[PDB]
Amino acid sequence: KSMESVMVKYDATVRNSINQVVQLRYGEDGLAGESVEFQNLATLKPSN
Amino acid sequence: NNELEPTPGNTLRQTFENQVNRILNDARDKTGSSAQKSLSEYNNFKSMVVSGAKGSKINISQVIAVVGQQNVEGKRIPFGFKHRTLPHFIKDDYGP
Amino acid sequence: MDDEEETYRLWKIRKTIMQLCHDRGYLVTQDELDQTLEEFKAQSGDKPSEGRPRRTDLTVLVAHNDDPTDQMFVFFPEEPKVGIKTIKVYCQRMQEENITRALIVVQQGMTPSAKQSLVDMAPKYILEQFLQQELLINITEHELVPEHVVMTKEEVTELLARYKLRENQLPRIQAGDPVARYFGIKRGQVVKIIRPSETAGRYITYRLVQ
Amino acid sequence: RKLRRQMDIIVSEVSMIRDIREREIRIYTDAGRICRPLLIVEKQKLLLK
Amino acid sequence: TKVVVENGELIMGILCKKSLGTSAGSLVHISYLEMGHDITRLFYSNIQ
Amino acid sequence: MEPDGTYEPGFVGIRFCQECNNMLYPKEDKENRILLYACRNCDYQQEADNSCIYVNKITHEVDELTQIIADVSQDPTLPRTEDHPCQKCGHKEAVFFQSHSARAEDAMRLYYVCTAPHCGHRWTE
Amino acid sequence: RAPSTSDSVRLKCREMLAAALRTGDDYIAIGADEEELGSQIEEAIYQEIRNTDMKYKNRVRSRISNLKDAKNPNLRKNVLCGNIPPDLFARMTAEEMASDELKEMRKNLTKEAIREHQMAKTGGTQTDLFTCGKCKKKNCTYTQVQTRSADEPMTTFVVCNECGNRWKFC
Amino acid sequence: DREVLRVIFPTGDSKVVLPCNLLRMIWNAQKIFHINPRLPSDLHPIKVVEGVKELSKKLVIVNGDDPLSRQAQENATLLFNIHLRSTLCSRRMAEEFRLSGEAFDWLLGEIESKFNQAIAHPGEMVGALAAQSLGEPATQMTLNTFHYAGVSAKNVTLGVPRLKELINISKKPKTPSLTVFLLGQSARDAERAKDILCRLEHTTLRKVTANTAIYYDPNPQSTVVAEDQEWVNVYYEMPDFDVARISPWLLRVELDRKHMTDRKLTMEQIAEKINAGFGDDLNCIFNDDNAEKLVLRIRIMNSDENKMQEEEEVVDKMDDDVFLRCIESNMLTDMTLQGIEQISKVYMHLPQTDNKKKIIITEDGEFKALQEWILETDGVSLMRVLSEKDVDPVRTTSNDIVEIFTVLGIEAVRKALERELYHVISFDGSYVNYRHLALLCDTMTCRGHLMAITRHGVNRQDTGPLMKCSFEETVDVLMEA
Amino acid sequence: QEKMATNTVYVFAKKDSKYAYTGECRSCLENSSRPTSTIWVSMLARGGQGAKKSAIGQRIVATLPYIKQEVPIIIVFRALGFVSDRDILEHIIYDFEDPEMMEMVKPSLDEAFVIQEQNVALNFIGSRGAKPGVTKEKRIKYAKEVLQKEMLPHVGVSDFCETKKAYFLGYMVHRLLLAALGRRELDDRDHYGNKR
Ligand SMILES: [Zn+2]
Ligand SMILES: [Zn+2]
Ligand SMILES: [Zn+2]
């Protein structure tokens, strides 16, 4: 009943039923979560 | 004997109840680990557990060796029968 | 109590507010930023005797905003509960000084008329009010705190222009926020909120003051 | 109890309980009480033949 | 013991569920990405 | 005055009024410089036997060794011990237990009551 | 070096302090006069307080308690022989004086027991079975969860305390 | 980027969910192109550099006509661009990946294609998706037993009741809590931490007293309490001129030396506390800690003059006997000798070897764990706890989101709720997408106001009339509308 | 249907409210009607006041049938006519030799002196019952009927069984007092022997 008020918009910004902006873009990237995957960055490697 | 040493930041009873619990857990785990060894790879059960189906070693413990301690909210069964659980037990009994 | 440690509080709050002023853009001297408590006692010649006027000594002018409007003022009232009487004398002092901004730091409570008079003050002048215990710890030192930047009206103009953003659409920010009180932000103004992103690496948002 | 054991006292109804801790003997003959039959052990042995 | 497949050819490795699906690093997720739902559904029906 | 003495003054919980069996109340005789005890409902009043009229914060003593008649010993479900000599009677069958109450007794230490006739003694080891 | 003062109360405290040093003849055997020592202690309290404060009087009183002790006469004696100068003795730096014989022992063991009260919180677990590839040490913890759950198989989850690593039996 | 990355992840975990597994994609090129370690690795490194620079341009999510949008473009893509830049290094391509330029060139087209794919559909009702994304893990074992030991108290009651309460935004948690960090030596010195423990911990006067008793004492110095008799008698420097009229009645309290061991306390602190609270009107005297027992015997300051039935006022201003009880009733129950007056009296200990935290950078640039003493407390006086010396105001947090709003504000709230929801989620161990949790916090905070997003706050909302009426009240919103 | 056993006084904590402890017993008639006759003795946790008496938390305040508010147990004892504290104490315990039991009851004794007369006590209880005008015969007479019939019917509503009635209440308080002192263990609600 709470979360039904919100949807994604075509300008990538996340907005509500009264068109106000929730986010600059959905998940701060606008990309699909399904296309996300677990990865090691490994740049936090111990020795410089 | 009251010669038992209470755990720091805990009561002697809390230590005692904790201490008996480690033992009942270590033994069951040890006897469980014996059963994990004791089973052939030929077994359907080990086959079922390994495959990632609906089974595990704890099951083997429960089916073959030992179910383990029953508890109430994680605590040993309370003395609902006047400082006892049942009239089959002696008063002040603390057996598992 | 109130014998030595108090100096540490007065030192730390003095640094917190100076860093605050420094953060406001005012060119606080690095040494003022850098000074120690031992030096702080030394700088004020603190504690030749007890029950003196450190709060009168703590009272200071702040000076900077690369934009030379100059002259912000900070006053520490001696009374825990401040009355209009001290506010009028203060009003006289700020008027006589013709300062641009006055910050008054109160220890405890205030009369509602003084509270009112502080709120209204003057349509063309601002008076600032800070409670000493809330100053006693710098909240912006906290790890959960994002970076807040006040936006120029033109930046706001450019922001709306670039997106075609409606004023309503912008998330509001309540002026009841201590941090809002920290920036001295005014209603209708926008603050730039800089956050780390676990997704983007960097996330920037904005809220208009309500 | 011997009257209880003699069936001159209704075992099916008459309950008789003593608490040394309270220095009390309570007895109840009201309806709705649950009871069950048990073997009577005497001298760590069964009374039955 | 350890699982390894090359050019659609299984070199070694007894299979598990973490391989078989509903988890990260699963064959199912990457087939969905490369082969797409349509090829993956026919493979899945076929294997079963 | 030494850290080896004790404080058992034998506090006087109450004394009834001879006129009504009601409690007598403290009072000073500022004229005679002496403590007195009086009933409220009547004119009955009498001098005090001690300067102490009050005590506070309780229970730092061995209650469980008290308030326990040896008649517990008749309970068969209470275990006898093979440990002999009723601290009195040269006979075993001492009955034993913890405190078993509210302070329920982090003291899991056994407390011994001989069940042998002619002693009734409650101790512990 | 007898320090004379003009204040009657100070002298009166000095007389009271001289009286406290009279305890148990030790001043005789050492041969030091109680009045001079009593006068030097009060002056020293005064050298710091510079006023007949109740708290100043309190220091005399804490000094009184230390003087009037009978379980540590060697304390008085250490003071009397100049090993603990009156200006030092007054200058506290002894944490409720009780050195020699037992309260110090008690004080140490008390410092031990209150130190012990952090030592283990109230719990435990560690298993030390699974190696952690982030630190080679088998400093790991294990989980028994997913009694039934859904289609996901019941797993044993292992977490490494140090360097935070968690992985599954599967 | 490596230097920046240390800031972004203080946990030092480099394993994150991200789009497009380039390793698998790069590997597939090798499987396709048939590159092997016994074949030469012909490559033009500048092409690699340019390919990354061009692909970076391809990473468009917003216009690039102005630098701010580009800055918006740059920061939003920043983390991915670092994964991309770290992966697509010239040395990696030639040495580790041994890719050919053609293999690299085909791969670039593939990566971009993967990028084009990652884009979510505009118009999406992701919000309904997120509500379901919260609802499903709530169904699991969020309430299944307090399995947590962690050398401490069970705190901050697991799951749904906290989740229900959280949704209900109860003014105060059912189980408030606060984690006390220790700066410098306190993290390594127990003795320092205990000194903090003594300073922080709540202490009532009733907590401190061994016993109390009321006595009739003819003479303050020739007391009837003969054990204390030299102790009173020896005192004389006390103004005993106004004590010739003070309460003839004696009140005496016995103090727990065990408590003095317990909280590390002293008599002088106690006497000065009592007088400051009650004022000058209460006379206070005590024996030394080296005595047989700690006792404190008190008197009322009957200041000689008008305090002697001066104006009758047939009221009996106060009887003595009863007044010793009113003070004692008040003495035990009211006075707090030490501590915050709502934190009960807790500070459970944990060795920071507990979790992946306080991981610190070193000269080598490698991450290392820092062990420490910590207390987990039940309490929420965030101003007071922040105000405490030696405790770290930076890391110190509390389970109460309300104090975060009150002190740090709604922005800090957005993060703490985010951490806490994640924390409940971390307990169930079932991964849930983070973006949604980030999204959820935005929804509650979008107003900048802390309020129940439930029906308990709908009337304050600016939402449409059909929405509010849909919340079962119907007619009331509709009549007003 | 599972119910709790009647005519059996049980003590439970009421710490969720201003009441430190509670002792309850229902006193329904054996056959006549089984009206229930629920009795509450609740220990009030008003551990404090101000400058009034520094110790309100030792009050007990009985909960009488039909009465518009709660009243001290000791007031009932005055209505029973036992004006002598010694007599009430025997009613409380045959062994007052324990000072601890004596000190705990002492604050209830302080309450007893505001009303000594049985007649005033009956009118008092009646005044708490309702307002039949100034006719304080009726409040007493009503109190008399409640004391006989509405109070502990299970022992008998006969006049001479009022003194006899008094003997049960003191043990009931005593049982409460042991548990309130802590000497008694807290009664279980889950126990079936305490159930019917
Ligand atoms: Zn009398
Ligand atoms: Zn014997
Ligand atoms: Zn590890």
Side-chain angles (χ1 to χ4, degrees), chain H residues 301-318:
Chain H
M301 291 301 299
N302 194 24
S303 192
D304 186 30
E305 204 192 345
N306 52 25
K307 268 84 187 178
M308 192 187 55
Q309 64 179 15
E310 185 76 10
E311 320 195 24
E312 187 106 9
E313 209 29 47
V314 193
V315 177
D316 298 333
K317 296 175 181 174
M318 198 57 175

Side-chain angles (χ1 to χ4, degrees), chain B residues 10-89:
Chain B
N10 296 305
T11 69
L12 201 165
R13 297 185 190 300
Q14 288 161 22
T15 306
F16 176 89
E17 64 173 350
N18 178 66
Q19 283 298 111
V20 301
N21 182 56
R22 67 191 285 165
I23 304 165
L24 271 47
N25 178 95
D26 167 72
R28 89 211 169 78
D29 252 289
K30 188 172 291 163
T31 54
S33 309
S34 284
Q36 161 58 18
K37 288 187 184 294
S38 298
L39 265 59
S40 62
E41 301 290 338
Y42 182 78
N43 194 326
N44 292 302
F45 211 74
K46 207 180 198 175
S47 289
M48 192 271 190
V49 168
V50 169
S51 69
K54 298 180 174 183
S56 284
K57 181 192 182 189
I58 185 61
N59 297 111
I60 308 178
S61 302
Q62 296 210 323
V63 303
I64 308 188
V66 49
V67 172
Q69 174 68 54
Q70 293 300 314
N71 47 31
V72 172
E73 300 180 351
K75 301 183 181 300
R76 307 171 77 223
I77 303 299
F79 287 153
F81 187 73
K82 181 65 182 185
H83 303 76
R84 293 180 286 180
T85 51
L86 288 175
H88 295 277
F89 299 102

Side-chain angles (χ1 to χ4, degrees), chain H residues 78 294 428:
Chain H
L78 184 61
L294 294 182
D428 177 38

Side-chain angles (χ1 to χ4, degrees), chain H residues 12-13 16 98 108 124 187 209 227 231 280 285 291 316 355 359 444 450 470 473:
Chain H
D13 180 26
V16 289
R98 300 179 70 86
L108 288 177
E124 185 63 34
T209 298
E227 48 181 357
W231 293 107
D280 180 75
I285 193 163
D316 298 333
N355 50 42
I359 306 300
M444 192 169 181
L450 179 62
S470 298
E473 285 306 314

Side-chain angles (χ1 to χ4, degrees), chain H residues 310-376:
Chain H
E310 185 76 10
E311 320 195 24
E312 187 106 9
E313 209 29 47
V314 193
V315 177
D316 298 333
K317 296 175 181 174
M318 198 57 175
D319 180 54
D320 296 277
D321 182 30
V322 291
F323 190 64
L324 296 179
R325 287 169 196 291
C326 286
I327 288 163
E328 177 274 86
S329 286
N330 173 21
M331 186 169 59
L332 287 165
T333 316
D334 187 23
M335 186 175 289
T336 299
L337 269 65
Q338 183 58 281
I340 307 178
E341 191 69 19
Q342 83 278 348
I343 60 167
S344 296
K345 53 104 241 140
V346 89
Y347 294 94
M348 188 56 61
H349 186 81
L350 265 104
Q352 203 72 35
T353 267
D354 188 37
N355 50 42
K356 178 190 280 294
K357 289 179 188 77
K358 291 185 66 61
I359 306 300
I360 59 178
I361 193 63
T362 207
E363 68 293 347
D364 193 10
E366 66 180 352
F367 292 157
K368 56 186 173 188
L370 187 52
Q371 298 191 333
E372 71 172 343
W373 303 128
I374 69 179
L375 300 183
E376 292 138 350

Side-chain angles (χ1 to χ4, degrees), chain H residues 134-287:
Chain H
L134 179 60
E136 185 272 340
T139 72
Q140 297 291 338
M141 297 180 301
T142 51
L143 187 56
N144 193 328
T145 320
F146 298 93
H147 187 71
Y148 173 83
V151 296
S152 293
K154 284 63 177 175
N155 218 28
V156 148
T157 296
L158 179 64
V160 179
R162 176 59 172 168
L163 178 60
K164 283 178 58 166
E165 178 183 87
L166 187 63
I167 290 166
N168 203 23
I169 192 58
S170 302
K171 187 176 175 180
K172 299 299 174 179
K174 184 176 179 171
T175 58
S177 180
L178 187 169
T179 315
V180 181
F181 296 81
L182 301 178
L183 286 175
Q185 193 181 342
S186 302
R188 75 187 53 97
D189 190 61
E191 267 341 292
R192 199 176 156 135
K194 281 186 301 301
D195 191 70
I196 302 169
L197 191 162
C198 170
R199 207 171 66 227
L200 295 174
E201 194 183 359
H202 192 278
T203 297
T204 64
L205 194 147
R206 192 180 291 230
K207 174 63 171 83
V208 187
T209 298
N211 207 334
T212 298
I214 299 165
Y215 304 75
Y216 182 77
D217 182 22
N219 189 324
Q221 288 85 4
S222 302
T223 186
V224 67
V225 188
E227 48 181 357
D228 294 341
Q229 197 169 348
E230 79 169 79
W231 293 107
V232 296
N233 164 39
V234 60
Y235 294 135
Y236 180 81
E237 71 299 325
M238 181 71 190
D240 63 337
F241 178 80
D242 56 13
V243 313
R245 285 201 67 249
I246 67 180
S247 175
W249 294 97
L250 163 67
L251 167 56
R252 190 182 69 133
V253 295
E254 190 167 0
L255 305 182
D256 194 58
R257 278 185 170 136
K258 305 182 302 300
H259 181 76
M260 307 312 173
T261 57
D262 186 54
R263 309 301 141 174
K264 181 66 187 288
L265 302 179
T266 62
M267 301 296 282
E268 75 207 272
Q269 296 182 334
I270 297 168
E272 85 173 321
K273 188 100 186 199
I274 292 166
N275 274 110
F278 290 127
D280 180 75
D281 300 334
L282 185 68
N283 190 340
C284 295
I285 193 163
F286 60 91
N287 58 346

